[PDB]
Amino acid sequence: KPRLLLFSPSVVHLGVPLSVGVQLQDVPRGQVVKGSVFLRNPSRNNVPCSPKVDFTLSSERDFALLSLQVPLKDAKSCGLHQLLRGPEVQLVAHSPWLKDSLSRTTNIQGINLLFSSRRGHLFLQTDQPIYNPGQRVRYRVFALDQKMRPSTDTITVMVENSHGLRVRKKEVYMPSSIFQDDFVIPDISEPGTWKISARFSDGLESNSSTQFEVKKYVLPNFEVKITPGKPYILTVPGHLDEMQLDIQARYIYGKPVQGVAYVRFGLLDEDGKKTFFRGLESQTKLVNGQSHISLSKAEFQDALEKLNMGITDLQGLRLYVAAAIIESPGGEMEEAELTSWYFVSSPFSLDLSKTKRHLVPGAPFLLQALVREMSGSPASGIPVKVSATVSSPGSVPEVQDIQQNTDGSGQVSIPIIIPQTISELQLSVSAGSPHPAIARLTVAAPPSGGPGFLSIERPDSRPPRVGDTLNLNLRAVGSGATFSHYYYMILSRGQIVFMNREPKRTLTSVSVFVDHHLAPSFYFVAFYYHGDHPVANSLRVDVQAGACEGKLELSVDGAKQYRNGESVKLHLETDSLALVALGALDTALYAAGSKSHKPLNMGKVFEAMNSYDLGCGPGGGDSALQVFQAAGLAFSDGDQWTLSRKRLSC
């Protein structure tokens, strides 16, 4: 019963090649299969929307990777835009071998795919994060193709007013891949937040937008920041940790501010209303630009009693602290508001978004948990207790408890032995003590009586740097079928960038060299056939950010005591010829009242690269189809297909 498999990402983006994978299954070793793959929309009499490709996969080398060019002109010619019931395009493989040999109803096999015109990466860079009306705004947009290489397509950049009204629309050819423009804010502009949006002209929903706030400001001379002692305030009954906070005022040039800090406290709930305290305002002289102030337990209780709020009512209210530091004898004042004190019972926060659901009976259930300190960076050495209660369909549900400590990066990889008879597994995790942060989730075993299950095991369990080959252990947990090989592929940014097969053995170790093509994360989908049905199990792999390979290094000759009017030579170093874009900003502008939105950094860049990721979740799936769906794959084996994604997002 020879079979042909057809793989491609669940979404095809217009204007960029679509990676399609095909591999023969259970061939008699004596015949070759030829054909081609193309994209056609049946609403227009099956008019092809993409040139065909050389299918030509031999029996000796079943696996083959195909790149379907999808030009924009072909999409228009076959009329995708005329579609009404959402975007839908069919990808089919044409090969007479299906009809003559397999005796199928027709010599065509395909998959239903969604599509969108979102293509390439666009990044905008405003002159400064905040403008006052009447000034000249400067901005530029970087056009990058899907491979993060500079592009040259026409773009349309439009500025939206604070009210959402377009005040500019420039359609510009940008062969240099960088476009520099500059307009002027109306003097009568009311304070608010504007928005600059750009998109490739050919595409329609390929837009990326940056926002700049406009308000009537005057450049502050010093910036005051309220740094608390602890990001969290325990509110458990009986125990209420003291609320001590530190106030720091510093001149932008760095020297300390000698003034007086007038502080007012209040409770700020979700909606935004503030319930200020009366008589609780503490003002102290800033000594060396530092002013420690704390609220004692007794007096704070009285203040709450005055408002009759009560401790029990401090569920999630945010303690609002505003300081009005007046520098003396300077006179000017700058206000800083603290909006990060959450009254939380649990000092720690357990993030269980990295634990894959759909446990595989007969193989260890690796439980991943990120122990991030509440309102802070990940912490280390926080014991975590896991109490898994495997459900026995025909016996008492055994209670298994395992304890482990954080590795040091905030993550704990705690295996859990699970017998093959379990109907479902219920586990509760608690991190740290006293008052541990508890998170509870229940995972149900897939339905029994089906084909075998495949379990991916990663011995390392640490984030792989680029250039580090990580090994995955593949094991067939079900019946001992005689499948010869293991087929696996790597999905990075909704693209099948590598497909291969590894022969079955007593030990199955697959080396996956991780390169920049796999960043900031990828999927590892591997499968085998138990006679006729497929079996698969994906495994999302979070790759470390590392750094960009461009290697741009801004540097000066130290000695940060430059007196104005002095010549400072800036050394620009890059590993290759490149376009360098430079912005020298005043740190005060970050102090000027605003949301302090961060600039463009590699964290945001990799978010753009990962923004095209189609798979949702850590991986795994109850059925072979579901794991392919969750992985962001479109799959069809002739007798079994994958339903098209109902939306562009999971």
């Binding site: 007086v260 007012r264 305002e281 003002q283 002289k285 009005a324 007046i326 003396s328 004898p329 300077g330």
Partner: protein, 130 residues
């Protein structure tokens, strides 16, 4: 040795609903006296309720502002002759919304609050000179 008389009142019933901070600025060339200032605070009836004076700048935190007009004063010590005759300034801020300032001016005892400037219906010129 010069004696100040700072006075603050409030029509009230709208807007403020809170205390105030005084930013009284001394005439350039001298600073407020130290000892005479604390005794404003030492009293049990503590109108000023806090202070911070340094150079020609004096900061007061009037914890309460009544409807009527009150006056609290202090002396100042001089160390350099005032370079030129001009009006000084002082401001009052709202504690819970410092934007609601109240700017005013005050001259030397034998001078005037505002600069000598004759103004017509449309054009105004200065007569500042000997």
């Amino acid at each position: 040795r010069v004696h100040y008389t700072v006075c603050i009142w409030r029509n009230g019933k709208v807007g403020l609903s809170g205390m105030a901070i005084a930013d009284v600025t001394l005439l350039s060339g001298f600073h407020a006296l130290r000892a005479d200032l604390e005794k404003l605070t030492s009293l049990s009836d503590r109108y000023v309720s806090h202070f911070e004076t340094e150079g020609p700048h004096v900061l007061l935190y009037f914890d309460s502002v009544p409807t009527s007009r009150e006056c609290v004063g202090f002396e100042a010590v001089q160390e350099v002759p005032v370079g030129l005759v001009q009006p000084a300034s002082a401001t009052l801020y709202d504690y819970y919304n410092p934007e609601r300032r109240c700017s005013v001016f005050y001259g030397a005892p034998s001078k005037s609050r505002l600069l000598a400037t004759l103004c017509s219906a449309e054009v105004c010129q200065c007569a500042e000179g000997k």
